[PDB]
Design a binder for this molecule. Structure first.
Ligand SMILES: [Zn+2]
Ligand SMILES: [Zn+2]
Lengths: 279, 772, 277
């Protein structure tokens, strides 16, 4: 399990931490520009076979953060004081050192500070003749000086360098969603290698949106829907990152939406092994 | 019937204790309650009062001797007047006997009152309920004079004569008077007399359903066998449900949601009670989207509880797109599992077996659906502009504000309910396909019982009063309390966001506070019997339900004292209690009275509890033009700022801090209320104006908050020490702020903030109360 | 489709101190939520280049009916006096109360010289923007003067004076300290090679107007005078994004001013682009 980490060093403030499906729709819309139409459907067949990506997760000066599994909650009492049993459960992200410990059900530590800060900036709308104001709020993720966001890739490198590494240079100059005409989703890219040790067992946490075919073991549910070319997507029941499946490959559902091409929604799981308690 | 006669048999058993502490007859209150129920059957009485004297007479085991005394007395008495069998009336005596021991636990001295559930050293002076003109503060112990117990009985003599002899009608009478009466006179008894008679009735109704007979109760088989079944549920997703609405529906709509959630909370609990054959005594508590019912362990009931749960959740999936979930779990216990055995608390670890089944079920958030992860693309859905639910087109109907927007159908029922809140006296639980129902629950429909109107339905929820005023004789009376203060507008209605802040002190702003009791889940594990937990979850319940109304009405100056207050409390304050659950509250209002209220709630809470539990209030200040889903988002994060630090501390103002970690933001409660005593009466006089000769120097207090901004870029610099001294010199104000002109060598060695760090929040409240 | 991305970089020189504000010193400038350095939003610079280019077209709604179609469907002026969307007049989008020019569909927005570049939503169409106005932050020379003890904001107290009795009514305004340097970045997208030319002529025209007008704030009391110093023109072709092999067309404008770049250097510096398109 040596993962090609893709670091996204932000320029302007992101609209959100990109979900896994925000990325794959961004990547597919890149390859429809820098590779034409037929290479995107070829890209979709590559992720069906072996290739998997993950959701984006923050990083703070090489200290790579990762989602906390839901494997720790049913037996957090078997780990370890009541104040510690809540602040460890309330958390959302764990460090790369501490994500490996909770896969083996070891005692561990939460991070102290979160890198990003969801701030809300007020903007205004002005008519051109009378300069009369019309306020509306707006809110976006604002990252710190060193920090940023990354995500993972595991698969054949001839699919990486052929597809993703072009797309993450085209997506450095048009954003990953949000009001990317205000310089929101823009970044610069550097690639790395990253290693997470997984204990061999039949249960697995998913580092991306699961969208399962069979019912998982323990799952934090998530409802979101996208926007392809001005067309609303229906709300789908993805699972959030860090839920536990047993031998589930996930899936992608093509959607109609009245476009010239079919539109796929990435929900392929990203399994890393986990040790579950009794239930 | 034979069912209900055992239900009142446990409920009316320990009566005789309130006639014992007077001394109308001799001792042995089982002999007293036999005479107290015999003479009530004489005048203005039914026939059961002679027969319900049997239950009070033969408990405590001094009266069932050789199983032989019980028969000859009731050989003369006639059970055929209602059709009771000679042995089946003997059966109900044993069942009340065992339930009289199970709710009690391991257990006369003199006449000690109700010792308080938070400090068992202190006690309650005896008082009535209804939360009006009285705050029961646990004070010094005073054994009650026996002359007081005479007028208690005569008032109870009259109230038992009027009320229908029925299980749901004696409960609001016994809760009215015997709430503050101790059951067993002992050292630090914190078990009330209402609850000890209520759980005695609650268990006896389950022992009848479990299927035990008289000699099985006599044998040791009925205890130490799995026959009881602790149902417990919880709503997970309340704060993500009420507050996630956009900039529509200002405060008539949020106040409608928070009572809509309580309807669903009762529409499930009352569904469990009817389907299992249980009364309202079998509810241990129900507050804040979390209940607990004691029930029987049959194979028959567990078939029913899976039907209740699967029908609730599939309602909560279509009507709300997985925003709210009702996780119901049960666990079979034995009889011995209630009381403490040895030194080990069996009831806590039996509650940990049940709370863990909650924690797993909150993870598998929608498991019993089977169309959950199924995908079917339906043509052309759209979403609501108010609440953001996705509906198919055509179901979106025009609103009650503008015909331009196309809101949910379930929002127009909550705007119309948003106007019917002052014109309201309760709800009526009735069938789904009825006329006049605003809102539907997971099992039934709720008709509004207005100001002028007649109640309709088979069960009638009645808000904030325990007396069946205009209720028919056939109906069931289910009283629920709710924190319900609201400032009325010039009309007869609920205030707006944009009314409260125009009528505020100083500048205009909306003052949201959201605070909650800390370490409360560790507190309810201290209890070790169903008598003890039903009390502690009810006295904690009535603070945020009833006694928070009397604080906002402006009372109890002896208990509270003086708070950090910009102006003295008005007659009709402009405060809108959105939600207040029992562990939690969320109150909006005029932003310089919410500031005054938070120190007025905390002060009264610290004397309601005997100094043992604390609040953590997270104050925010937001403009009227602000969507509520952001106001609850920022304030709850200002809550968890004041929660993870010390759990006894108030957030006051958004304040800048160094990146070291030594400087924590939110003020300790006692530490802040001396910063008001020093800083405020020397720079502020009251009612939004400043002290003498400090006017035309409001530029100064901004400059004094500029020097605080030099402490934040560099904490190590001592540039703030002389700039403090000089700016007070040039303006001639050398007398003000002596704590800030000099460094504190005591504060350096303690590694605590300097006194220029604390001055930000105490200056801004004085500054924002002036127009600034 | 996609051809390449003309990335403009350079420096913004706020010659006279400018103010933006957050509405929360009574009118504080916007800063970062962490470091506290002030900046220019991308929206306060896209919309300001939109207002100034909107008015110029508003005068020339007649003369540009042969160069651009979909201006024959407009007459100059607002639509405030009758609350009627897409009427005969030009500013036909009421956002909350402000009436802004936004074209309603695609095939009229493709010809309209504002909505083609700056972008327009409308109903059923949503023609996206073509420029990407990235934010502007202080130059590392000025990020270091932030660390060198200098104050980067300063309060100006203006007053309001009674005409007869000459009373004083002050107020405060936190501005950015005059003389500062912001480094900007404007990333055009080459969608169509037919009207490749005019969008760079119509963007630099809006900067000729922004250099004479103000950039937000009080402005007419003096708080604008933003000045553009260009440093790099690029092209970033479609060959570049496929492989990453650095063969992008670069035009040197290291000492070129924004009126010395429109025609003084526009045939000159973008001569190398026109062979590649
Ligand atoms: Zn709705
Ligand atoms: Zn246009």
């Amino acid at each position: 399990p040596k993962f090609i980490a893709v670091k996204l060093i932000p320029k302007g403030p992101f609209r959100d931490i990109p979900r896994a499906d925000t990325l794959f729709g961004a990547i597919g819309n890149a390859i429809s520009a820098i590779h034409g139409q037929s290479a995107v459907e070829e890209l979709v067949d590559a992720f069906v076979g072996g290739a998997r990506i993950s959701s984006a997760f923050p990083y703070s000066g090489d200290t790579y953060y990762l989602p906390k599994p839901l494997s720790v909650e049913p037996a957090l009492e078997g780990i370890l004081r009541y104040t510690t049993a809540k602040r460890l459960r309330k958390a959302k992200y764990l460090d790369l050192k501490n994500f490996e410990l909770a896969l083996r059900l070891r005692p561990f530590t939460i991070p102290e500070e979160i890198p990003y800060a969801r701030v809300d900036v007020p903007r205004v709308v002005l008519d051109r003749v009378t300069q009369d104001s019309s306020i509306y709020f707006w809110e976006e993720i604002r990252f710190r000086e060193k920090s940023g966001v990354y995500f993972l890739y595991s698969g054949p490198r001839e699919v990486f360098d052929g597809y993703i590494a072009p797309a993450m240079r085209f997506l450095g100059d048009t954003g990953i969603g949000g009001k990317s005409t205000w310089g929101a989703g823009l970044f610069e890219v550097e690639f790395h290698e990253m290693k997470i040790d997984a204990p061999g067992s039949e249960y697995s946490v998913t580092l991306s949106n699961a969208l399962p075919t069979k019912t998982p073991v323990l799952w934090r549910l998530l409802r979101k829907g996208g926007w392809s070319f001005g067309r609303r997507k229906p709300r789908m029941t993805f699972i959030a990152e860090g839920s536990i499946v047993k031998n589930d490959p996930g899936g992608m559902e093509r959607l109609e939406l009245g476009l010239s091409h079919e539109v796929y929604v990435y929900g392929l799981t990203f399994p890393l092994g986990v040790e579950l308690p009794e239930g | 019937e034979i069912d209900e006669l055992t239900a009142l048999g446990g409920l009316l058993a320990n009566i005789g204790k309130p006639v014992q502490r007077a001394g109308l007859y001799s001792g042995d209150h089982s002999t007293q309650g036999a005479r107290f129920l015999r003479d009530l059957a004489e005048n203005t009485g039914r026939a059961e009062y002679e027969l319900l004297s049997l239950f009070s007479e033969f408990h405590h085991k001094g009266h069932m001797k050789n199983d032989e005394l019980m028969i000859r007395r009731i050989k003369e008495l006639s059970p055929e007047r209602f059709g009771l069998t000679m042995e089946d009336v003997l059966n109900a005596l044993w069942i009340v006997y065992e339930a009289d021991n199970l709710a009690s636990g391991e257990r006369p001295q003199a006449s000690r009152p109700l010792y308080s559930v938070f400090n068992p050293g202190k006690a309650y002076p005896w008082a009535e309920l209804d939360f009006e003109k009285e705050l029961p503060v646990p004070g010094d112990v005073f054994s009650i004079r026996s002359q007081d117990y005479r007028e208690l009985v005569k008032r109870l003599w009259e109230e038992l004569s009027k009320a229908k002899l029925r299980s749901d009608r004696l409960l609001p009478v016994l809760e009215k008077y015997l709430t503050f009466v101790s059951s067993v006179t002992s050292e630090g008894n914190i078990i009330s007399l209402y609850d000890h008679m209520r759980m005695t009735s609650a268990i006896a109704l389950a022992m009848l359903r479990a299927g035990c007979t008289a000699e099985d109760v006599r044998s040791g088989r009925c205890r130490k066998e799995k026959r009881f079944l602790l149902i417990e549920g919880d709503f997970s997703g309340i704060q993500d449900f009420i507050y996630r609405v956009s900039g529509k529906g200002t405060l008539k709509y949020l106040r409608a949601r928070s009572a809509y959630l309580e309807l669903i909370g009762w529409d499930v609990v009352l569904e469990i009670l009817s389907r299992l054959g249980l009364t309202r005594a079998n509810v241990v508590f129900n507050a804040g989207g979390h209940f607990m019912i004691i029930a029987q362990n049959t194979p028959d009931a567990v078939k029913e509880l899976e039907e209740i749960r699967a029908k609730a959740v599939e309602w909560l999936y279509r009507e709300f797109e997985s925003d709210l979930y009702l996780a119901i779990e049960w666990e079979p216990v034995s009889g011995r599992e209630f009381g403490r055995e040895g030194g080990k608390n069996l009831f806590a670890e039996a509650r940990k077996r049940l709370k863990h089944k909650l924690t797993v079920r909150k993870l598998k958030r929608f498991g019993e659906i089977k169309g959950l992860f199924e995908h079917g693309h339906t043509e052309r859905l759209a979403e609501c502009p108010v609440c953001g639910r996705e509906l198919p087109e055509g179901k979106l109907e025009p609103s009650a504000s503008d015909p331009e927007t196309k809101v949910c159908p379930t929002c127009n029922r909550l705007v119309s309910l948003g106007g019917n809140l002052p014109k309201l006296l309760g709800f009526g639980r009735t069938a789904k396909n009825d006329a006049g129902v605003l809102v539907e629950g997971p099992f039934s429909g709720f008709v509004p019982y207005l100001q002028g109107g007649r109640p309709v339905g088979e069960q009638i929820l009645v808000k904030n009063t325990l007396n069946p005023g205009e209720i028919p004789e056939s109906a069931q009376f289910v009283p629920y309390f709710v924190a319900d203060y609201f400032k009325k507008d010039p009309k007869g209605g609920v205030a707006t966001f944009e009314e409260l802040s125009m009528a505020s002190t100083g500048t205009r702003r909306l003052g949201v506070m959201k605070g909650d009791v800390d370490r409360l889940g560790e507190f309810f594990s201290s209890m070790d019997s169903p008598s003890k937990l039903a009390t502690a979850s009810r006295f904690m319940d009535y603070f945020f339900k009833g006694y928070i109304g009397a604080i906002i009405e402006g009372k109890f100056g002896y208990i509270i004292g003086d708070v950090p207050s910009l102006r003295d409390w008005p007659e009709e304050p402009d405060i809108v209690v959105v939600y207040a659950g029992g562990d939690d509250f969320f109150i909006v209002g005029a932003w310089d009275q919410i500031f005054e209220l938070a120190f007025r709630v905390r002060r009264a809470f610290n004397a309601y509890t005997g100094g043992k539990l604390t609040l953590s209030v997270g104050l925010g200040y937001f403009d009227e033009r602000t969507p509520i889903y952001r106001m609850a988002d920022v304030v709850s994060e200002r809550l968890d700022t004041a929660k993870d630090e010390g759990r006894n501390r108030v957030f006051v103002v958004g304040r800048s801090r160094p990146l070291d970690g030594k400087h924590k933001l939110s003020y300790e409660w006692n530490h802040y209320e001396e910063l008001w005593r020093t800083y405020a009466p020397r720079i502020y006089a009251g009612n939004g104006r400043l002290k003498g000769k400090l006017e035309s120097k409001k530029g100064l207090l901004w400059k004094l908050l500029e020097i605080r901004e030099l402490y934040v870029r560099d904490p190590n610099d001592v540039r703030w020490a002389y700039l403090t001294a000089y700016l007070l010199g040039r303006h001639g104000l050398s007398d003000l702020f002596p704590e800030l002109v000099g460094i504190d060598t005591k504060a350096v060695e303690r590694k605590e903030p300097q006194p220029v760090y604390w001055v930000d929040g105490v200056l801004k409240i004085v500054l924002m109360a002036v127009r600034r | 489709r996609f051809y390449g991305k003309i990335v403009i970089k350079g420096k913004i020189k706020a010659v006279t101190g400018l103010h933006i504000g957050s509405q929360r010193i009574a009118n504080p400038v916007i800063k970062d939520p962490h470091t506290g350095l002030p900046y220019i939003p991308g929206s306060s610079l896209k919309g300001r280049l939109r207002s100034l280019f909107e008015i110029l077209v508003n005068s020339r709604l007649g003369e540009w009916r042969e160069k651009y179609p979909s201006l024959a469907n407009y007459s100059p002026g607002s639509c405030r006096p009758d609350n009627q969307e897409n009427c005969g007049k030009f500013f036909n989008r009421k956002i909350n109360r402000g009436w802004i020019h936004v074209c309603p569909d695609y095939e009229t927005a493709l010809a309209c010289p504002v909505c083609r570049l700056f972008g327009a939503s409308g109903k059923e169409s949503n023609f996206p923007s073509r420029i990407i106005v990235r934010d502007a932050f202080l130059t590392k020379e000025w990020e270091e003067k932030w660390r060198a003890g200098e104050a980067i904001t300063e309060a100006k107290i203006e007053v309001g004076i009674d005409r007869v009795t000459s009373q004083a009514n002050p107020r405060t305004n936190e501005r950015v300290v005059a003389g500062a340097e912001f480094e900007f970045e404007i990333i055009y997208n080459v969608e169509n090679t037919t009207h490749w030319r005019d969008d760079i002529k119509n963007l630099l025209t809006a900067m000729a107007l922004l250099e004479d007008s103000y950039l937000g704030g009080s402005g007419s009391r003096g708080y604008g005078k933003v000045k553009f110093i260009f440093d790099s023109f690029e092209f970033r072709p479609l060959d570049y994004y496929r492989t990453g092999k650095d063969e992008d067309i670069v035009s040197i404008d290291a000492r070129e001013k924004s009126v010395s770049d429109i025609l003084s250097g526009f045939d000159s510096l973008f001569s190398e682009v026109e062979g590649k398109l």
